[PDB]
Symmetry: C2
Subunit: 269 residues, 2 copies
């Protein structure tokens, strides 16, 4: 059933938005709308231009009758900065101060609207990494991992803090003892390029634990993103990582809490 | 300024990313610096397309207090096709688990699958007045978020570990009493809660969750599970929707039975 341009633009927009990071043959669309490849290409130029102008993302086109298009979610620096500032202000509330130097995030992480933004910012920053899968550890980071994975078009793998399983010992920020994390061996292909995502990085042991867990799968760290990094941790982590926010050494007794920008802007050109 | 074409693309993106939200025509008129008449015409193009393509319903509410609202909906034919495909995939003997369980980890890890399940849940409960989605850690978490994002509501996660509320219940794995808790600061009392879970075997977990909401003057708006163990619709007095039915996996024999759940009852049988 043929759609005229207006109907195709609408359906193509929905289809692209719901199939990010997937190379779609022009052929799939020409047959879907029983339209000429040339009309589709024309429609895609309109979408590509609107997507860039509105800060939705990039449409990459591969020419030829055998060509295709790929939608790449991307966030403009201006929106990233504004979103992060707003989010930081929201967290810089003494009522969130938690024992041990932690921050209460449960409410913000319960909101798909916020997670969507966070996920897209991670997806944007790591758009060009060849990611095969997103990994995080139960449980606070799970929703962040799915948000990022949905923009990236890859599966999520959840490491458990408890079949043929692989296990690694690691230490946590509570400046505590040795714990173990595991992941079933049939949960991930060898050589996978992994984006590690977590909500909070205090000491860096949880992430180092996941990075070490990856060596057991002969997998590679494709990138590392965290919502909040405790002040001065660039030290305890060997791999590059991206953070949206920095929690400056909080104090429960003084009931003060400072929150600054993470290092994310370094990732914008 | 936006030419009609660009405006349709942006409007489409805008509606798709703001479901279950009443948006005043004025907002669009201002965004595109255009007459309301032109916006309404675009909305008709989108409504028609969304309807024919099975994306959802664009609801236009007349009046200055009105506006437009995008409601994600899934056609019955697509839901049946999707559930069957999902069922066939789970009926693989390789997913065998002791105790009458099936391996769901790999599918619960795919946003593509989650998106569909979340949409089907959001579609069935589209007209219920839901304020929050609730699930219990940790398997159901991604399904909960998927449903919640289509419904425009926050997610609340019950912990099985300050002013905390608690309930005790018996899982389907162990007969030992368990405790699920939820911070009092995690949910507004009187909320219409859509409960979501991956697998309902005994029914205790969901029952426990139903009791826990009592403690908040909360009202169960609906219950949705991905898989229900054969023989559970006599262990729950509450109405629930399930996508698949898992017939007691063949312990000794390497076979597994999967059939549609009761979801068709929630489509146009209403």
């Amino acid at each position: 059933m043929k759609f005229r341009r207006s109907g195709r633009l609408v359906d193509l927009t929905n289809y692209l938005l719901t199939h990010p990071h997937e190379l779609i043959p022009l052929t799939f669309f020409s047959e879907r709308y029983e339209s000429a490849k040339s009309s589709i290409s024309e429609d895609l130029t309109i979408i590509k231009q609107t997507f860039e102008q509105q800060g939705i993302g990039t449409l990459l086109t591969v020419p030829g009758a055998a060509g295709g298009v790929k939608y790449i979610p991307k966030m403009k620096q201006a929106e990233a900065e504004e979103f992060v500032q707003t989010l930081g202000q929201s967290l810089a509330n003494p009522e969130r101060i938690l024992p041990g130097g932690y921050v209460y995030l449960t409410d913000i992480l319960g909101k798909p609207s916020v997670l969507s933004k966070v996920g897209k910012l991670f997806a944007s920053v790591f758009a060009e990494r060849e990611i095969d899968v997103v990994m995080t550890v139960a449980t606070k980071g799970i929703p962040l991992a799915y948000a990022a994975a949905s923009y990236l078009n890859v599966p999520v793998v959840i490491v458990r803090k408890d079949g043929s399983t692989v296990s690694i010992n690691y230490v946590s920020g509570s400046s505590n003892r040795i714990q173990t994390m595991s992941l079933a061996k049939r949960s991930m292909k060898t050589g996978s390029n992994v984006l590690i995502i977590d909500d909070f990085m205090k000491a860096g042991g949880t992430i180092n634990g996941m990075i070490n867990l990856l060596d057991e799968f002969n997998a590679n760290v494709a990138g590392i993103g965290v919502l909040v990094e405790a002040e001065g941790v660039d030290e305890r982590l060997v791999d590059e990582y991206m953070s949206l926010l920095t929690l400056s050494t909080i104090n429960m007794k003084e009931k003060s809490i400072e929150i600054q920008n993470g290092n994310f802007l370094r990732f914008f050109k």
